[PDB]
């Protein structure tokens, strides 16, 4: 019944049938993206119209189309032809990955480059990577992938251990032609294997780890109704899934007495970019927009009980479309469970004689995706005390290169002759805020130091200052760890019992933002990543910080063009966009497979409640 | 056997007997501090000499003494008379705390102040707080406590809800004299109760929480030998306990194949200061040095199974001295357990077809202390991948005041008429480093941005730079979150297989440091707290960043005096001192009892190993 329910296999089948009968899904067509549209703004929305947005690619070279269909009425609502030289190319298709290696294997220039290195072409894997926009005028309007080569010594070998440096190729995946093959010189192919399951490398496995058993003998404390509606320890929310963004949280609300109080209307990771900082022409174009270009939801892992998710686990199995419109289930793609989280509150009072201890816990909603060599876990946490937290976990295998003789200022050495270029992993969280309703505002809070003098004779005083962000042109903010800078989202029309606006405080990790030169292509295409915080006025079509079609878009789409409207955000329906990321100088310990590193952010109540909201937690 | 074993009840009894026999522990003497001395630098050394350091107070006014005793040989090694007006007073005795409320209850100035407020003296509790050093000349060379008053309506009432603002008294606890009573005016005593176990405030307790069962059917994976030596998943260490510092970690080392490789010789929280930022004369002197003035180990809680520590727990019960030299056991004062810690490493490889997942775990060593209204948990974590982490958890009841009718820039309102002054909680971690041995150096590492141009034509390159700190005068460093600043401790004489020096990287949280004006009393006494990182050359007597005698001591001791020696620290026996803290602007949700907030730091290997150290972790 809920408009926020996960797409079903039947809905996707009906979308396929509607497109085919409309003539929009012939044999040269591919679905590059399909997803359900959220309901438009309207608190009296009663008639359910479930609609899907579809991007349709054409493998024969015709212009692609953006289509909106209504599965409820069985109709096409609109179909627009796209001019990709203007507004960007469609996301990369899974079937285009294989094309790159196959086309190169018959190209005379590629084979000559391999022959000079004495590499058997049957052992050379090609990583198919997004192209970006650089100096090559012939690429405008064409779907290009760029290929970098790795040697696989045998079928189970880790090819990442054996990069073929000094060589790159560009491929038109529609006309199926190799546009350029660039050979800048011969580098030795690193010879050590990186096979982390080979006993010769691992040594004898440890026998010292004893089991940890985590069970819930009465079942979990949360309930799941309607397929994806969660109720847990006064929290209420809907868990969505979109093939582009992955797990999306809707309608995050907290039951305060007899009142269901909204907090966040929609929470998602709306983009993530991985820019590389190696100036070699072999790699200086390399920037992954994992969300915008590749679609992180379509590569979600099936998560195995006891290994990926430990404890009393409830799974969701989202359904997505394949390239032809057939439904495909991601079995066990989302894990949900509660976890003990240590002490919540504790005090032993001398005067009253009362000793008080309570334990904390958190609800975990997670999924894991694999894009080539990297694997990312996305974790949303709800805590008893009203805190909301997001954490990204980065693991997998680092992207490699040769390590040049003489060293490098932009590449780490991991093994003899094996390098790992410096890079970042930068995320954008899109938080469509709804603190006690939709009339919200953002304040920047800095610590204020005070000078010793009159009214501060001992020089001990300090204070804080809050600055209201009233218009989009002033709502592009930077972190300042030194002044303890945070941002508060409040509702100026909803007061707590002390007559103060209710609010939530955003605590950032204050990691470095995008390091590339401001005049670079990546800085223009990933402009969101240059600043820590953006606030926009809500609009239906402003979904991603990089725009709708990120692949080979020349730049400026998304947040810089939204902000340019300079709209009122002082007590309005607003969206907070938080940039946060990891700067990765690879270390020897990251090889041959990388231990998890993490980054994230959290939101804590700030006068949202009239007192601590966990006074009714029992002792157990 | 082990020179790092915990003090035994027998050793403490023997110290008492030795001091008695020497004429140093008659009826008028009190032990203010007693602790074991670490072995001096030198392998083997004096076969076994257990030495104890004792601070002896005299309740008749005679000068106190510092005494060193050898329990092994039954001898006093040295005894020196202290000039406390010069070098500082001894730590506060537990028995002096009770004196303050009793003396004030018979002082006619105090009674007049309470009668003016219509308060019954039998219901007024006095918080006895350390005095610091301010403008009062009569306090030099005397042991002073200052008292702030709270009303307790009935014996089980939380007095913190009812501060009596506008009133403070100073007490000489040796001569039993009230020196000053300062009354700046009547404030209403806030009337709402703060009794977090009263059903009228909590409402009905939740029935929704289902049990989480954490068990270890085969027992834990660590072994405890010699009372306090831990071996766990390649880690080796000794867990010490000192009445001033609390839990101290010794000889942290990692078994890498056939070699036991040192990492940290001694790790402790060597000071903690809590400065208040309210310029009211009633509170502008308020600064707690919980470690140096109060001794946090003395107030460690007994931790109860299932509430404080959950899972398969191994306890230590350290022994301390009371004020007469009798041994006192802190039953179950230290918890030790291992915890699941999610995914360690994960990759699903398209080309090889191998899917790989491993789980992480950590070893936890913790204790909890209660000082008046505040309770602090101290947590040390060891991870499978070589990471070492410290976390402090702050909870308890916030210190209160009246909330002035015209508002305040330095106090938060928590309830009608009830305020909570702004303050910080700042920690100093002392890390006596031993990365692969004692020849170490510290490098500061910053991200380096590069401009677009020749050799960086696409403007994507970025780099890093390392600066060796070669002498103490240049080793006082500040955080810079914007440039991703970290510090690496390396050993230039011990290289990994790539011929790079082995190292560990310190990751700070980059929270604000001390906010007080640099000319204030607290900035001089807590000078360590004004900078994020200090490095000194190791010396036996440089134990605490504030010096040996913090109570009522002006500046002149501690870290600024140590670094003035400008010693060589480039490949030497060095000590890292890291400042980190929380800046607390109390929120309504912190009342009537505060949910845990946290701060800490971590150290991760940086080319210490020749590849990932967790390749031999099994799948289970
Ligand atoms: Cu990385
Ligand atoms: Cu606090
Ligand atoms: Na050292």
What's the sign of the alpha-carbon dihedral A452, A456, A460, A462?
negative
Nearest CA-CA partner of B158 in A609, A348, A345: A348
Please report which helix (H) or strand (E) contains residue A202, including its range.
helix A199-202
Tell me if B357 sits within 8 A of B346, measured CB to CB.
yes
Contact A410 B461 (CB under 8 A): yes
Q: Which residues of A495-518 are buried (b: 16+ CB within 10 A; e: fewer)?
A: ebeeeebbbbbbebbbbbbbbbbe
Nearest CA-CA partner of B479 in B451, B504, B449, B509: B509
| Helix, strand, coil fractions of chain B, as percent rounded to 5 | 15, 45, 45
In angstroms, rounded to a whole number, what is the distance separating the alpha carbons of residues B321 and B12?
7
Size of interface A-B (CB pairs under 8 A): 429
Q: Which CATH class is domain B94-195?
A: alpha beta
Place of tokens 């038109």: A172
Backbone angles phi, psi at A70, to 5 degrees: -105, 115
Query: In angstroms, what is the span from residue A587 Cα to ligand 1's centroid?
Result: 10
In eight-state DSSP terms, residue A471 is B
Angstrom CA distances, B131 to B76, B250, B294, B578, stand at 33, 33, 12, 26
In angstroms, rounded to a whole number, what is the distance separating the alpha carbons of residues B579 and A65?
58
Contact B459 A519 (CB under 8 A): yes
Q: Which residues does A560 contact at the CB level (< 8 Å), separation at least 6? A: A527
Nearest CA-CA partner of B91 in B485, B610, B551, B491: B551
- My answer on whether omega of the bond before A368 falls inside 30° of 0, hence cis, is no
List the structure tokens of B241.
């306990």
In angstroms, rounded to a whole number, what is the distance separating the alpha carbons of residues B262 and B491?
11
**Smallest CA–CA distance from A604 into chain B, residue:** B589
Gaps in chain A with C–N over 2.5 Å, residue before each? none
Q: Which residues does A574 contact at the CB level (< 8 Å), separation at least 6? A: A433, A440, A441, A442, A489, A535, A536, A537, A538
Start-to-end CA span in chain B (Å) = 37
Q: Which residues does A150 contact at the CB level (< 8 Å), separation at least 6? A: A124, A125, A126, A127, A159, A160, A162, A163, A164, A400
Give the nearest partner residue to B613 out of A196, A500, A589, using CB atoms. Answer: A589
Specify burial of residue B26 (Cβ count, 10 A radius: 0-12, 13-18, 19+). exposed
Contact A212 B214 (CB under 8 A): yes
Contact A516 B152 (CB under 8 A): no
Q: How many residues does chain A have?
A: 620
In angstroms, rounded to a whole number, what is the distance separating the alpha carbons of residues A64 and A86?
13
In angstroms, rounded to a whole number, what is the distance separating the alpha carbons of residues A465 and A482?
14
Query: In angstroms, what is the span from residue B264 Cα to ligand 3's centroid?
Result: 8
- Which residues make beta-bridge pairs with A169? A147, A181
**DSSP-based three-state secondary structure for B296:** helix
Q: Per DSSP, which regions of A372-454 are E strands? A: 374-383, 388-396, 401-402, 411-415, 418-421, 423-433, 441-449
Q: Which residues does A20 contact at the CB level (< 8 Å), separation at least 6? A: A325
Q: Name chain B contacts of A422, Cβ cutoff 8 Å.
A: 462-464
**DSSP-based three-state secondary structure for A53:** strand
Query: In angstroms, what is the span from residue B374 Cα to ligand 2's centroid?
Result: 8
**DSSP-based three-state secondary structure for B104:** helix
The CA-based dihedral angle spanning residues B77, B433, B1, B248, taken in that order and rounded to the nearest 10 degrees: 80
Contact B345 A594 (CB under 8 A): yes
Tell me if A305 sits within 8 A of A230, measured CB to CB.
no
Query: In angstroms, what is the span from residue A252 Cα to ligand 3's centroid?
Result: 50
List the structure tokens of A188.
């030795």
Place of tokens 């007024």: B124
The CA R_g of chain A, rounded to the nearest whole Å, is 26
Tell me if B375 sits within 8 A of A346, measured CB to CB.
yes
Query: In angstroms, what is the span from residue A419 Cα to ligand 2's centroid?
Result: 46
The answer on whether A290 is annotated among ligand-binding residues is: yes
DSSP per-residue string spanning A310-374: -SS-EEE--EEE-TTS-EEE-TT-EEEEEEEEEEEEEEE-TTT--EEEEEEEEEEEEEEEEETTE
**Gap from B447 CA to chain A (nearest CA, Å):** 9
Tell me if B163 sits within 8 A of B188, measured CB to CB.
no
Q: Name chain A contacts of B515, Cβ cutoff 8 Å.
A: 447, 449, 462
List the structure tokens of B122.
């039998």
Q: Which residues does A270 contact at the CB level (< 8 Å), separation at least 6? A: A245, A291, A428, A429, A430, A543, A544, A545, A577
Place of tokens 């990287």: B505
Give Cα A507 distance to the centre of its chain: 18
Query: In angstroms, what is the span from residue A597 Cα to ligand 1's centroid?
Result: 9
Q: How many residues does chain B have?
A: 620
Give Cα B591 distance to the centre of its chain: 24
Q: Which residues does A244 contact at the CB level (< 8 Å), separation at least 6? A: A33, A35, A91, A291, A292, A295, A296, A297, A544
Give the nearest partner residue to A277 out of B451, B462, B618, using CB atoms. Answer: B462
Q: Name chain A contacts of B416, Cβ cutoff 8 Å.
A: 498
In eight-state DSSP terms, residue B473 is G
| Helix, strand, coil fractions of chain A, as percent rounded to 5 | 15, 45, 45
Tell me if B415 sits within 8 A of B401, measured CB to CB.
no
Neighbours of A122 (CB within 10 A): 7
DSSP per-residue string spanning A548-584: S--TT--S-TTHHHHHTT--B-TTB-EEEEEEEEEEE
In angstroms, rounded to a whole number, what is the distance separating the alpha carbons of residues A97 and A126?
9
**Alpha helix locations (H) across A424-574?**
521-525, 559-563
Which of A290, A532, A548, A573 does the annotation list as catalytic?
Answer: A290
In angstroms, rounded to a whole number, what is the distance separating the alpha carbons of residues B232 and B225?
12
Query: In angstroms, what is the span from residue A278 Cα to ligand 1's centroid?
Result: 13
**DSSP-based three-state secondary structure for B436:** coil
What's the sign of the alpha-carbon dihedral B86, B91, B93, B99?
positive
**Gap from A506 CA to chain B (nearest CA, Å):** 14
In angstroms, rounded to a whole number, what is the distance separating the alpha carbons of residues A288 and A274?
5
Domain with CATH 3.10.450.40 in chain B: 1-87, 94-195
- Which residues make beta-bridge pairs with A442? A469, A489
Angstrom CA distances, A608 to B73, B193, B454, stand at 63, 21, 54
List the structure tokens of A9.
């296999």
Tell me if B225 sits within 8 A of B210, measured CB to CB.
no
In angstroms, rounded to a whole number, what is the distance separating the alpha carbons of residues B64 and B55?
7
- My answer on whether omega of the bond before B585 falls inside 30° of 0, hence cis, is no
Specify burial of residue B563 (Cβ count, 10 A radius: 0-12, 13-18, 19+). buried
Contact B458 A343 (CB under 8 A): no
List the structure tokens of A3.
């408009």
The CA-based dihedral angle spanning residues B159, B160, B164, B168, taken in that order and rounded to the nearest 10 degrees: 110
In angstroms, rounded to a whole number, what is the distance separating the alpha carbons of residues B192 and B578?
41
Give catalytic status of residue A566 as yes or no: no
In angstroms, rounded to a whole number, what is the distance separating the alpha carbons of residues A608 and A534?
22
In angstroms, rounded to a whole number, what is the distance separating the alpha carbons of residues B54 and B66?
6
Nearest CA-CA partner of B176 in B271, B81, B101: B101
**Gap from B292 CA to chain A (nearest CA, Å):** 20
In angstroms, rounded to a whole number, what is the distance separating the alpha carbons of residues A42 and A325?
30
Specify burial of residue A108 (Cβ count, 10 A radius: 0-12, 13-18, 19+). exposed
Angstrom CA distances, B401 to A83, A464, B104, B162, B516, stand at 66, 19, 20, 8, 20
**Smallest CA–CA distance from B597 into chain A, residue:** A344
Catalytic residue positions of B? 290, 374
In angstroms, rounded to a whole number, what is the distance separating the alpha carbons of residues A579 and B6?
48
The answer on whether B376 is annotated among ligand-binding residues is: yes
- Record the resolution, in angstroms: 1.8
**Gap from B24 CA to chain A (nearest CA, Å):** 33
- Which residues make beta-bridge pairs with A431? A267, A576
List the structure tokens of A428.
């954008």
Contact A213 B216 (CB under 8 A): yes
Tell me if B557 sits within 8 A of B547, measured CB to CB.
yes
In angstroms, rounded to a whole number, what is the distance separating the alpha carbons of residues A579 and A581?
7
List the structure tokens of B396.
């308890």
**DSSP-based three-state secondary structure for B405:** coil
Q: Name chain A contacts of B593, Cβ cutoff 8 Å.
A: 345, 347, 356, 612, 615
List the structure tokens of A364.
């975990």
The answer on whether A603 is annotated among ligand-binding residues is: no
Q: Which residues does A62 contact at the CB level (< 8 Å), separation at least 6? A: A28
Nearest CA-CA partner of B244 in B40, B547, B620: B547
β-strands B501-508, B418-421 pairing: unpaired
In angstroms, rounded to a whole number, what is the distance separating the alpha carbons of residues B166 and B159?
16
In angstroms, rounded to a whole number, what is the distance separating the alpha carbons of residues B505 and B435?
11
- Which residues make beta-bridge pairs with A230? A224, A237
Give Cα A611 distance to the centre of its chain: 34
Q: Name chain A contacts of B408, Cβ cutoff 8 Å.
A: none
Nearest CA-CA partner of B375 in B399, B352, B340, B357: B399
- Most distant CA atoms of chain B, gap in Å: 87
Place of tokens 């157990």: A620
In angstroms, rounded to a whole number, what is the distance separating the alpha carbons of residues B485 and B531?
14
Domain with CATH 2.70.98.20 in chain A: 196-619
Contact A220 B205 (CB under 8 A): no
Tell me if B105 sits within 8 A of B121, measured CB to CB.
yes
- Which residues make beta-bridge pairs with A7? none
Specify burial of residue A598 (Cβ count, 10 A radius: 0-12, 13-18, 19+). middle
Q: Name chain B contacts of A220, Cβ cutoff 8 Å.
A: 210
Place of tokens 């997001």: A390
List the structure tokens of B229.
């030596």
Place of tokens 């405030």: B201
List the structure tokens of B82.
């202290």
- Which residues make beta-bridge pairs with A168? A182
In angstroms, rounded to a whole number, what is the distance separating the alpha carbons of residues A131 and A517?
19
Tell me if B578 sits within 8 A of B601, measured CB to CB.
yes
Residue A123 has, within 13 A of its CA and on its CB side, a CA count of 19
In angstroms, rounded to a whole number, what is the distance separating the alpha carbons of residues B106 and B129?
19
Specify burial of residue A138 (Cβ count, 10 A radius: 0-12, 13-18, 19+). exposed
In angstroms, rounded to a whole number, what is the distance separating the alpha carbons of residues B421 and A433?
30
User: CA angle, corner B289, sides to B12 and B178, nearest 5?
Assistant: 90
In angstroms, rounded to a whole number, what is the distance separating the alpha carbons of residues A564 and A542?
13
Nearest CA-CA partner of A171 in A217, A82, A241, A109: A109
* Determination technique used: X-ray
Tell me if A551 sits within 8 A of A293, measured CB to CB.
yes
In angstroms, rounded to a whole number, what is the distance separating the alpha carbons of residues A590 and A375?
13
Among all bound ligands, the one having the nearest atom to the CA of B582 is: 2
**DSSP-based three-state secondary structure for A235:** strand
User: CA angle, corner B363, sides to B357 and B364, nearest 5?
Assistant: 135
**Any idea which fold A1-87 has?**
Nuclear Transport Factor 2; Chain: A, (3.10.450)
The answer on whether A578 is annotated among ligand-binding residues is: no
Number of H helices, E strands in chain A: 7, 34
β-strands B574-584, B423-433 pairing: antiparallel
Give Cα A498 distance to the centre of its chain: 38
DSSP per-residue string spanning B442-509: EEEEEEEE--SBTTBTTS--EEEEEEEE-BGGG-EE---GGGT-EEEEEEEEEE-TTS-EEEEEEEE-
Q: Per DSSP, which regions of A204-297 are E strands? A: 213-215, 223-225, 229-232, 235-242, 246-256, 259-275, 287-289
In angstroms, rounded to a whole number, what is the distance separating the alpha carbons of residues B99 and B351?
76
List the structure tokens of A395.
């693991």
In angstroms, rounded to a whole number, what is the distance separating the alpha carbons of residues A489 and A439?
10
Q: Which residues does B108 contact at the CB level (< 8 Å), separation at least 6? A: none
Number of H helices, E strands in chain B: 7, 34
**DSSP-based three-state secondary structure for B606:** coil
Residue A197 has, within 13 A of its CA and on its CB side, a CA count of 15
What's the sign of the alpha-carbon dihedral B605, B610, B611, B615?
negative
Specify burial of residue A42 (Cβ count, 10 A radius: 0-12, 13-18, 19+). exposed
Of 2.40.30.10, 1.10.620.20, 1.20.1260.10, 2.70.98.20, which CATH number belongs to B196-619?
2.70.98.20
Tell me if B391 sits within 8 A of B375, measured CB to CB.
no
Specify burial of residue B610 (Cβ count, 10 A radius: 0-12, 13-18, 19+). middle
**DSSP-based three-state secondary structure for A474:** helix
Q: Name chain A contacts of B613, Cβ cutoff 8 Å.
A: 589
Contact A339 B522 (CB under 8 A): no
Give Cα B97 distance to the centre of its chain: 21
Please report which helix (H) or strand (E) contains residue A404, including its range.
none
List the structure tokens of B7.
């003090």
**Alpha helix locations (H) across B144-227?**
199-202
Give the nearest partner residue to A458 out of B213, B284, B350, using CB atoms. Answer: B284
């Amino acid at each position: 019944a809920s408009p926020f329910r996960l797409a079903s296999a039947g809905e996707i089948s009906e979308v396929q049938g509607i497109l085919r009968t409309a003539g929009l899904l012939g044999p040269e067509k591919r679905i590059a993206y399909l997803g359900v549209l959220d309901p438009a703004r309207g608190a009296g929305s009663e008639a359910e119209d479930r609609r899907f947005r579809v991007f349709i690619h054409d493998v024969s070279g015709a212009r692609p189309q953006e289509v909106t269909v209504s599965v409820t009425n069985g109709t096409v609502i609109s179909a627009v032809e796209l001019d990709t030289a203007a507004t960007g190319e469609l996301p990369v298709l899974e079937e285009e990955f294989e094309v790159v290696e196959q086309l190169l294997a018959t190209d005379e220039r590629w084979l000559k480059a391999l022959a000079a290195r004495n590499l058997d072409v049957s052992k050379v894997r090609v990583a198919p990577l997004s192209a970006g926009v650089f100096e090559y005028a012939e690429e405008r309007g064409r779907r290009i992938l760029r290929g970098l080569a790795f040697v696989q010594d045998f079928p189970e070998d880790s090819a990442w251990a054996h990069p073929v440096d000094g060589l790159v190729a560009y491929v038109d995946v529609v006309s199926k032609e190799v546009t350029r093959v660039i050979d800048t010189g011969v580098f030795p192919v690193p010879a050590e294997h990186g096979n982390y399951t080979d006993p010769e490398l691992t040594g004898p496995l440890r026998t010292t780890q004893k089991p940890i058993s985590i069970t819930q003998p009465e079942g979990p404390s949360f309930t799941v109704t309607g397929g994806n509606h969660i109720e847990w320890e006064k929290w209420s929310l809907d868990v969505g899934f979109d093939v582009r963004e992955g797990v999306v949280l809707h309608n995050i609300a907290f039951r305060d007495g007899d009142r269901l109080r909204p907090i966040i209307n929609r929470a998602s990771i709306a983009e993530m970019v991985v820019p590389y900082g190696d100036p070699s022409p072999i790699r200086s174009w390399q920037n992954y927009f994992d969300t915008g270009e590749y679609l992180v939801g379509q590569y979600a892992n099936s998560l195995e009980l006891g290994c990926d998710c430990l404890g009393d686990i409830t799974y969701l199995s989202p359904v997505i479309s394949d390239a032809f419109g057939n439904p495909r289930e991601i079995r066990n793609g989302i894990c949900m469970h509660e976890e003990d989280w240590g002490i919540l509150a504790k005090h032993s009072d001398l005067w009253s004689g009362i000793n008080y201890t309570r334990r904390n816990r958190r609800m975990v909603i997670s999924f894991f995706t694999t894009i080539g060599n990297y694997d990312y876990g996305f974790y949303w946490y709800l805590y008893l005390d009203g805190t909301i937290e997001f954490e990204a976990k980065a693991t997998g295998v680092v992207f490699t290169s040769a390590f040049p003789e003489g060293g490098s200022d932009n590449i780490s050495q991991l093994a003899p002759g094996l390098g790992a270029p410096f890079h970042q992993h930068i995320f954008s969280a899109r938080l469509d805020m709804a603190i006690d309703g939709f009339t919200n505002r953002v304040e920047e809070e800095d610590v204020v130091r005070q000078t010793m003098g009159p009214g501060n004779e001992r020089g001990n005083a300090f204070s804080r200052k809050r600055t209201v962000l009233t218009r989009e042109s002033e709502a592009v903010r930077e972190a300042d760890a030194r002044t303890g800078r945070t941002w508060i989202i409040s509702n100026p029309e909803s007061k707590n019992r002390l007559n103060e606006p209710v609010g939530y405080k955003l605590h950032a990790h204050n990691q470095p933002t995008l390091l590339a030169d401001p005049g670079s292509s990546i800085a223009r295409r990933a402009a969101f990543a240059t600043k820590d915080l953006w606030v926009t006025r809500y609009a239906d079509d402003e979904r991603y910080p990089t725009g709708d079609f990120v692949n080979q878009h020349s730049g400026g789409a998304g947040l810089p063009s939204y902000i340019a409207q300079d709209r009122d955000i002082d007590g309005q329906d607003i969206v907070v966009w938080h940039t946060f990321g990891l700067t990765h100088f690879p270390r020897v310990e990251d090889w041959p497979i990388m231990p998890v590193d993490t980054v994230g952010f959290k939101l804590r109540p700030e006068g949202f409640f009239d007192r601590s909201p966990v006074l009714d937690v029992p002792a157990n």
